[PDB]
Amino acid sequence: VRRVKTIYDCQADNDDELTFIEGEVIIVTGEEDQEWWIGHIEGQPERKGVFPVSFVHILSD
């Protein structure tokens, strides 16, 4: 369960996609593709789904 710190805003359109803005913490809970991981907003785990990796700043926390 690695953590990522969104450095770009991602305005999802599908409910499978995750919606977040710059500064959101996401806990990586799975992986789909190189640019597409599965995870949840830290502090609000009900916000989860797929999120673009090129939009987040990964911490090996």
Curated annotation (Swiss-Prot):
Residues 1-61 form the SH3 domain. It is found in: Cytoplasm; Membrane; Golgi apparatus; Golgi apparatus, trans-Golgi network. Phosphorylated on tyrosine residues by SRC. It comes from the Eukaryota. The modification Phosphoserine is found at residue 60. Possesses phosphatidylinositol 4,5-bisphosphate-dependent GTPase-activating protein activity for ARF1 (ADP ribosylation factor 1) and ARF5 and a lesser activity towards ARF6. May coordinate membrane trafficking with cell growth or actin cytoskeleton remodeling by binding to both SRC and PIP2. May function as a signal transduction protein involved in the differentiation of fibroblasts into adipocytes and possibly other cell types. Homodimer. Interacts with SRC and CRK. Interacts with RAB11FIP3. Interacts with PTK2B/PYK2. Interacts with CTTN. Interacts (via SH3 domain) with APC. Interacts with REPS2; the interaction is direct. Forms a complex containing RAB11A, ASAP1, RAB3IP, RAP11FIP3 and ARF4; the complex promotes preciliary trafficking; the complex binds to RHO in photoreceptor cells and promotes RHO ciliary transport. The PH domain most probably contributes to the phosphoinositide-dependent regulation of ADP ribosylation factors. This is Arf-GAP with SH3 domain, ANK repeat and PH domain-containing protein 1. It comes from Homo sapiens. The lineage of its organism: Eukaryota, Metazoa, Chordata, Craniata, Vertebrata.
